[PDB]
Amino acid sequence: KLNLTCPACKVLFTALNHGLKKEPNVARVGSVAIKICKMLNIAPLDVCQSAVHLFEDDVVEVWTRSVLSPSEACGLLLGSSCFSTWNISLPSVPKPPPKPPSPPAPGAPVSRVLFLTDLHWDHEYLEGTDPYCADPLCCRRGSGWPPNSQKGAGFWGEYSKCDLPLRTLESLLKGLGPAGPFEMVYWTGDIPAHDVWQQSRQDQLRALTTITDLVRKFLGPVPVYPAVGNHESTPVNGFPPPFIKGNQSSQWLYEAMAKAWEPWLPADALHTLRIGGFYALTPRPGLRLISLNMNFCSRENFWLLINSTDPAGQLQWLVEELQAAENRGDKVHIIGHIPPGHCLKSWSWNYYKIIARYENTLAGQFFGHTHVDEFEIFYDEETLSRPLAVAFLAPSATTFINLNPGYRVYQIDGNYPGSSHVVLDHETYILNLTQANAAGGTPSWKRLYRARETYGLPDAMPASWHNLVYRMRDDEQLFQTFWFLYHKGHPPSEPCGTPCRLATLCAQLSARADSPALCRHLM
Ligand SMILES: *[C@@H]1O[C@H](CO[C@@H]2O[C@@H](C)[C@@H](O)[C@@H](O)[C@@H]2O)[C@@H](O[C@@H]2O[C@H](CO)[C@@H](O[C@@H]3O[C@H](CO[C@H]4O[C@H](CO)[C@@H](O)[C@H](O)[C@@H]4O)[C@@H](O)[C@H](O[C@H]4O[C@H](CO)[C@@H](O)[C@H](O)[C@@H]4O)[C@@H]3O)[C@H](O)[C@H]2NC(C)=O)[C@H](O)[C@H]1NC(C)=O
Ligand SMILES: *[C@@H]1O[C@H](CO[C@@H]2O[C@@H](C)[C@@H](O)[C@@H](O)[C@@H]2O)[C@@H](O[C@@H]2O[C@H](CO)[C@@H](O)[C@H](O)[C@H]2NC(C)=O)[C@H](O)[C@H]1NC(C)=O
Ligand SMILES: *[C@@H]1O[C@H](CO)[C@@H](O[C@@H]2O[C@H](CO)[C@@H](O)[C@H](O)[C@H]2NC(C)=O)[C@H](O)[C@H]1NC(C)=O
Ligand SMILES: *[C@@H]1O[C@H](CO)[C@@H](O[C@@H]2O[C@H](CO)[C@@H](O)[C@H](O)[C@H]2NC(C)=O)[C@H](O)[C@H]1NC(C)=O
Ligand SMILES: *[C@@H]1O[C@H](CO)[C@@H](O[C@@H]2O[C@H](CO)[C@@H](O)[C@H](O)[C@H]2NC(C)=O)[C@H](O)[C@H]1NC(C)=O
Ligand SMILES: CCCCCCCCCC(N)(P(=O)(O)O)P(=O)(O)O
Ligand SMILES: [Zn+2]
Ligand SMILES: [Zn+2]
Numbered sequence: 001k002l003n004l005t006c007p008a009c010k011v012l013f014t015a016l017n018h019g020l021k022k023e024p025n026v027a028r029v030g031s032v033a034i035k036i037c038k039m040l041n042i043a044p045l046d047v048c049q050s051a052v053h054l055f056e057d058d059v060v061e062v063w064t065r066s067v068l069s070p071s072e073a074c075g076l077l078l079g080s081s082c083f084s085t086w087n088i089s090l091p092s093v094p095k096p097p098p099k100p101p102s103p104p105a106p107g108a109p110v111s112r113v114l115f116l117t118d119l120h121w122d123h124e125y126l127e128g129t130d131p132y133c134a135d136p137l138c139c140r141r142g143s144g145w146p147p148n149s150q151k152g153a154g155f156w157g158e159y160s161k162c163d164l165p166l167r168t169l170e171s172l173l174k175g176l177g178p179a180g181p182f183e184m185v186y187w188t189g190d191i192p193a194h195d196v197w198q199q200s201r202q203d204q205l206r207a208l209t210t211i212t213d214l215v216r217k218f219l220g221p222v223p224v225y226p227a228v229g230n231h232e233s234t235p236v237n238g239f240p241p242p243f244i245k246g247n248q249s250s251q252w253l254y255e256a257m258a259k260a261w262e263p264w265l266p267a268d269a270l271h272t273l274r275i276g277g278f279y280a281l282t283p284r285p286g287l288r289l290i291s292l293n294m295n296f297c298s299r300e301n302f303w304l305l306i307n308s309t310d311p312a313g314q315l316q317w318l319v320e321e322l323q324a325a326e327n328r329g330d331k332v333h334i335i336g337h338i339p340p341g342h343c344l345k346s347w348s349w350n351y352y353k354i355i356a357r358y359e360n361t362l363a364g365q366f367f368g369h370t371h372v373d374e375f376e377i378f379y380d381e382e383t384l385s386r387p388l389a390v391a392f393l394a395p396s397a398t399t400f401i402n403l404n405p406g407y408r409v410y411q412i413d414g415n416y417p418g419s420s421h422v423v424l425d426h427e428t429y430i431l432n433l434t435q436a437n438a439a440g441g442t443p444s445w446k447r448l449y450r451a452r453e454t455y456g457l458p459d460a461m462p463a464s465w466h467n468l469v470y471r472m473r474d475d476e477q478l479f480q481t482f483w484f485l486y487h488k489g490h491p492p493s494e495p496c497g498t499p500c501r502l503a504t505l506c507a508q509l510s511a512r513a514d515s516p517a518l519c520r521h522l523m
Pocket of ligand 3: 086087088089
């Protein structure tokens with residue numbers, strides 16, 4: 001026991017964790033925290049110096065606490081004095097024995113799938129403004145001007161906490177020629193910018209109509225299959241389950257999507273889309289595309305306080321779609337915005353259980369939301385050792401934060417009977433702002449890398465990505481590459497030390513939220 005109250009403990013972790021974000025050592029930061037404790041009379045210094053001694057005696061205990069923040073660490077140290085359970089009904093049909101997808105045979109075609117996510121169009125982006133304003137979003141009207149001649153916001157964007165003007169997005173679509181042709185496109189939400197404090201419903205629908213028409217303009221007859229992001233509504237993250245009716249429901253948003261996305265989605269899809277913002281359709285024989293609204297898994301969605309149990313019956317709906325694909329022989333692609341690893345515990349554990357059951361039917365999982373080049377591996381529930389699926393977390397088109405613009409393209413097993421529809425390889429394209437915003441610089445999108453090439457993989461199967469993680473656990477050079485691509489070729493100046501490495505690698509193995517057992521082989 002420590003004579004340390006709940007708010008008191010939060011002041012220390014604040015002054016420490018904020019300090020540990022760039023300060024070289026713990027000692028100097030430890031002194032600041034003790035001085036804070038003294039100046040404000042927050043607690044007895046013996047207790048304060050005892051807490052600093054524990055918060056990070058070594059980085060290991062804190063390596064587990066890499067996720068932990070003040071409220072999260074205090075609860076564990078103080079106790080209870082400082083989210084419901086539920087699960088899904090799986091059909092009684094016995095699980096087919098696991099068998100890997102057969103590699104494509106000679107002559108089997110390939111298909112290219114463009115993947116767009118996190119475009120975050122800022123209607124108010126303005127060149128020359130201050131990229132480091134006080135607001136959560138800058139490079140826009142109201143952020144001010146730079147101080148004493150410092151460089152303002154770049155023309156095509158900036159490496160800061162800023163989003164993109166329409167110019168950079170129009171430039172992205174126009175230069176897709178070399179990346180295609182595309183059989184279809186996946187678009188996992190987050191269309192508006194991060195100007196939350198001034199997002200009316202008119203603004204959000206303006207971003208939907210404006211970007212939808214733009215995408216449709218440069219893709220033309222190619223179908224685009226979108227998924228609902230967490231910024232698409234106002235207030236942000238607020239997606240009430242369909243049991244809420246009236247002007248406070250998300251119908252203003254869902255009925256606007258069904259109208260804007262009608263060219264791409266069939267009747268049955270729009271039906272569910274209007275109700276809960278999710279749908280399922282058949283884009284080609286043998287394949288079933290399922291678009292999930294991961295806002296109903298979101299931690300920021302305050303609406304789930306009413307009933308966080310499978311909101312909208314989506315997972316139960318997902319199970320039915322998956323089980324029907326299994327009986328039919330089809331394979332499944334799931335698209336969403338928030339990756340399952342970032343979901344609420346119950347929702348995530350149930351999704352993890354669903355993916356484990358239908359491993360032979362699932363051929364691809366695609367998400368975004370992280371804005372960086374990541375991937376989440378799923379393991380068998382019985383032993384948590386056989387990688388059986390992969391969720392590719394594509395990088396954002398926007399710069400938010402301190403990143404290069406970029407999109408993703410997937411090579412999948414082609415459109416033919418018996419195909420596995422699995423991802424065979426993928427590529428990432430970027431816009432190099434340092435060259436585009438420079439005097440005389442012109443937009444030129446280039447292929448950053450191809451996965452199988454840089455990583456030397458035999459394929460894009462779960463076992464290969466599983467083997468790529470532990471190769472990076474022991475190969476500092478192979479991880480730096482991944483770390484370089486992680487940020488779309490614009491890493492932070494802060495090198496990723498051995499605690500950062502294992503933390504990043506632990507994210508690659510944690511497709512289930514709150515499961516430390518998934519990273520037991522990292523130290
Ligand atoms: C956890 O910390 C608690 C707070 O710690 C303080 O806060 C930090 C920021 C620093 O300032 C640090 O130095 C402090 O210690 C701490 O709470 C303290 O606990 C002690 C005893 O456990 C309390 O002592 C008692 O105080 C009362 C009130 O004192 C004054 O008021 C009355 C009238 O209201 C007057 O009559 C008194 O003369 C005082 O002017 C006293 O009444 C009481 O004395 C009586 O009882 C004792 C024995 O019980 C007899 O010897 C006396 O003769 C009296 O009969 C105590 O002296 C202290 O008030 C309390 N302070 C605060 C701010 O809460 C706590 O002890 C720590 N907990 C643990 C588990 O360590
Ligand atoms: C909470 O909702 C669950 C989930 O069902 C959906 O929730 C609402 C949106 C509501 O409008 C229903 O029409 C939806 O179907 C309710 O039922 C649970 O359903 C899930 C599977 O989808 C299952 O895991 C649970 O065991 C079910 N529980 C029950 C009691 O049927 C449930 O009615 C709501 N529970 C609470 C406590 O609010
Ligand atoms: C959630 O948890 C368990 C899964 O192990 C389920 O317990 C079964 O409950 C159903 C009724 O819904 C019964 O048919 C089964 O007989 C129960 N268990 C066994 C071993 O028979 C539970 O039903 C699951 N489902 C839900 C909706 O929570
Ligand atoms: C429906 O709900 C909206 C949600 O905000 C109500 O609020 C108005 O609309 C915008 C967003 O669309 C808000 O930013 C404003 O605060 C509100 N309007 C104004 C002029 O400030 C809206 O009033 C509701 N609509 C109806 C018709 O009742
Ligand atoms: C984007 O373009 C910039 C500018 O051409 C590249 O930055 C250079 O990187 C080399 C690497 O050794 C440095 O020596 C130069 O000083 C950098 N130039 C500037 C102006 O900073 C950058 O490498 C390019 N990024 C990608 C992903 O292609
Ligand atoms: C250099 C690595 C850091 C990248 C920055 C990531 C920002 C994340 C944005 C959000 N997840 P999204 O909902 O906009 O996707 P948010 O929830 O923070 O808004
Ligand atoms: Zn985003
Ligand atoms: Zn998002």
